[PDB]
């Protein structure tokens, strides 16, 4: 309510509640976290990113986004928990402290604010953005089919009414371009993590082509380690591998774009579960999901620091 220590992390929140949370966190830890507005949504809502930094100019950074697909509520809920955990473990956990003393972490909890608000007021299963385009009565674009990586190719739909519609052209969605511009301007990101649900998978590039990435051997081992770490908590089983070999051919995905930009440690997490609840995961699983996911994320971060 009026203190991140009183905030209920075991329940799902609205857009306003999450945004308020950000202000409270920043007010409580001014020396560690700051709120940056990287753009505005199609409908004009501000797009915020939380920057966790210990100092420095343009220290190598880790990017983490959640909620690019509005209906995957477990992701924004995990992002809120992550934000609080960062402030609790710095100075207490030797590994994480080491990470923050040398790198910055950028966390975008609500990557698709228009769609998120829509899931709360009209359609709980909305997945796309909220932009409208003349030649169609259908609304929205699949933000994770809109990136400049094999755009328009197999793995995305060309019909505006489709849940996987890629849009008119790469980066047409302001929600996507806002991230692209910020990452490009920064120029020093070392890791790029995009979180989704559901399926319990840890994926690496590529999704748009069957071509194997040059760093396949290293990324596969990093994923193997992260999955083992995540499983150690509650025994949750995750599969891992390239997007195209694990799920299916998908074009215009964020991770493929970031990897092609030279950001080697690009991974997408697909959280719980494997279909029993799907997108409607019970609130009682928020904390356990967040706790185990953190172990997998920390593993990737550790590798990035020492590499
Ligand atoms: N559940 C869910 O959203 N799955 C992802 C799969 C994916 C991951 C990374 C790149 C491309 C595609 C989707 O965007 O459809
Ligand atoms: Zn998704």
UniProtKB/Swiss-Prot annotation:
| Major subcellular site | secreted
> Which prosthetic group or cofactor does it need?
Zn(2+)
List the GO cellular component terms: extracellular space
Question: Zinc as a keyword?
Answer: yes
User: Any idea which UniProt keywords this protein has?
Assistant: Carboxypeptidase, Disulfide bond, Hydrolase, Metal-binding, Metalloprotease, Protease, Secreted, Signal, Zinc, Zymogen
Q: Which cysteines bridge via disulfide bonds?
A: 138-161
Enzyme Commission code: 3.4.17.1
Q: How is the cofactor bound?
A: Binds 1 zinc ion per subunit.
List the catalytic activities from the record: Release of a C-terminal amino acid, but little or no action with -Asp, -Glu, -Arg, -Lys or -Pro; leukotriene C4 + H2O = leukotriene F4 + glycine
BP-aspect Gene Ontology terms:
leukotriene metabolic process; proteolysis
Ribosomal protein found in the keyword field = no
Record: residues binding substrate: 69-72, 127, 144-145, 197-198, 248
Q: Which residues form the Peptidase M14 domain?
A: 11-304
MF-aspect GO terms: metallocarboxypeptidase activity; zinc ion binding
Q: Which residues act catalytically here?
A: 270
Protein activity control: Inhibited by interaction with the S.magnifica carboxypeptidase inhibitor SmCI.
Spell out the subcellular localization from the entry. Secreted
Q: Quaternary state and partners of this protein?
A: Monomer. May form a complex with proelastase 2.
Give the family per the record: Belongs to the peptidase M14 family.
What is the protein's name according to its record? Carboxypeptidase A1
Species of provenance: Bos taurus
Full-sequence portion shown in this chain: 111 to 417 of 419
């Amino acid at each position: 309510a009026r203190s991140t220590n009183t905030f209920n992390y075991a329940t799902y929140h609205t857009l306003d509640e999450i945004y308020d949370f950000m202000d409270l966190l920043v007010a409580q830890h001014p020396e560690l976290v700051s709120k940056l507005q990287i753009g505005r949504s199609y409908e004009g809502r501000p797009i915020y990113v939380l920057k966790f930094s210990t100092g420095g100019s343009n220290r190598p950074a880790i990017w983490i986004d959640l909620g690019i697909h509005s209906r995957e509520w477990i992701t924004q809920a995990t992002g809120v928990w992550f934000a609080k955990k960062f402030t609790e473990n710095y100075g207490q956990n030797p590994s994480f402290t080491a990470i923050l003393d040398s790198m910055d972490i950028f966390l975008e909890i609500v990557t698709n604010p228009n769609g998120f608000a829509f899931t709360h007021s009209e359609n709980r299963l909305w997945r796309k953005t909220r932009s409208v385009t003349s030649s169609s009565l259908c609304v929205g674009v699949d933000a994770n089919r809109n990136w400049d990586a094999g755009f328009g190719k197999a793995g995305a739909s060309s019909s505006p009414c489709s849940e996987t519609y890629h849009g008119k052209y790469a980066n047409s969605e302001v929600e996507v371009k806002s991230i692209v511009d910020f990452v490009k301007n920064h120029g020093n990101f070392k890791a790029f993590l995009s979180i989704h649900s559901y399926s319990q998978l840890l994926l690496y590039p590529y999704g748009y082509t069957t071509q194997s990435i040059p760093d396949k051997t290293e990324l596969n081992q990093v994923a193997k380690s992260a999955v083992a770490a995540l499983k150690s908590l509650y025994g949750t089983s995750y599969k891992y591998g390239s997007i195209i070999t694990t799920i299916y051919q998908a074009s215009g995905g964020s991770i493929d774009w970031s990897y092609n930009q030279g950001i080697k440690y690009s991974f997408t997490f697909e959280l719980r579960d494997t279909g029993r609840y799907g997108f409607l995961l019970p609130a009682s699983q928020i904390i356990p999901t967040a706790q185990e996911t953190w172990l997998g994320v920390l593993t990737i971060m550790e590798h990035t620091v020492n590499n």
